[PDB]
């Protein structure tokens, strides 16, 4: 039982435009109806109405996130990680190693609590011999790893499995498309399936996509077919050894662009915008970064100007990944 306020039917509304106003009325339980008056649900006792006990229908709020896992509550804190990647229908947990146990009640979990995933995996290694390489065990849901993922306007194939792709930073790809004119040419020296590059390429005369990934190159070419794109040409192999010229350059390989800036400074006409994205310590994520591409600017002799520099996300322990937009002129 809660509290309410017994209050005749045709009076309703009133009392509760009534309550609004009070702030007494309360949206945790359902009205509840008596043949000649309501019973409006308030969280505390007030002065102008007829204050009863009486048993009311809770409302639910449907869960978010899921609290529904079952396990031992100790872990409760420690297996509960607090962000997943969801692309398309399928779901990517990251497990700590004290939990893997429940791995299946996990992503039954997600599953459930998500209706738009029809998979869940998670991210473990496989040791080879020397090298260690990574794999998505198959935790709940469908036995598929393909998936079209919907971006900003535009539908990506994608096999999450051979392909890397991460959809955090869809709020990102936007904010270069709007820094780019049309006409321009455009060139994404790491595309991925060309997340960035089809958005790109609604707003660019031509546009070069390379990747060193096969796979990637595969599904760029069936992105490009499925969303009726023409001015992209998809390019498989190290991008430094391709020699055309752009208006726009997308460096999304933070872990390595910083050897590329020399071959980007290399590929950039007057007018020419170059994104570049890159990991940096905390108190000084743009320290290196702006020193490498100052001596850089030297050397090719050009004069290189900042527009703006920002985080886009931060690596999960006190590592920043950053996002340097800065244009070349000669």
Not at 5 to 16: A, W
Not at 57 to 79: A, D, H
Not at 144 to 151: K, L
Not at 234 to 242: A, V
Request: glycine content about 6%; some cysteine.
């Amino acid at each position: 039982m809660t509290l309410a306020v017994k209050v005749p039917l045709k009076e309703g509304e009133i009392v509760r435009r009534r309550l609004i106003e009070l702030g007494a009325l309360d949206n945790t339980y359902k009205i509840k109806r008596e043949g000649n008056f309501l019973l409006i649900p308030v969280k505390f006792p007030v002065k102008g109405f007829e204050v009863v006990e009486a048993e009311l229908e809770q409302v639910s709020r449907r869960p978010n996130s899921y609290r529904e896992i079952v396990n031992v509550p100790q872990e409760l804190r420690r297996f509960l990680p607090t962000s997943f990647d969801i692309i398309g229908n399928i779901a990517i947990i990251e497990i700590p190693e004290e939990l893997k146990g429940y791995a299946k009640e996990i992503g039954r979990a997600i599953v459930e609590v998500h209706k738009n995933v029809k998979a869940v995996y998670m991210k473990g290694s496989k040791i080879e011999g020397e090298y260690r390489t990574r794999e998505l065990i198959h935790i709940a849901g469908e036995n598929i790893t393909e998936t079209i993922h919907r971006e900003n306007g535009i539908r990506l194939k994608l096999d999450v499995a051979k392909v890397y792709f991460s959809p955090r930073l869809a709020t990102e790809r936007m904010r270069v498309f709007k820094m780019a004119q049309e006409g321009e040419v455009v060139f994404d020296m790491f595309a991925g399936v060309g997340p960035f590059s089809i958005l790109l390429a609604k707003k660019a005369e031509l546009v070069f996509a390379c990747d060193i990934n096969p796979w990637a190159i595969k599904y760029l070419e069936e992105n490009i077919k499925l969303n009726k794109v023409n001015n992209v040409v998809p390019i498989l192999g190290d991008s430094r050894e391709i020699e055309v010229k752009a208006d726009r350059i997308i460096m999304n390989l933070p872990k390595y662009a910083h050897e590329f800036l020399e071959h980007a400074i290399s590929c950039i006409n007057d007018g020419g915008v170059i994104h570049y994205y890159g990991f940096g310590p905390e108190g000084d994520p743009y320290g290196w970064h702006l020193e490498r591409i100052r001596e850089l600017a030297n050397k090719f002799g050009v004069k290189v100007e900042v527009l703006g520099k920002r985080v886009i996300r931060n690596y999960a322990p006190r590592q920043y990944n950053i996002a340097i937009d800065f244009r070349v002129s000669f």
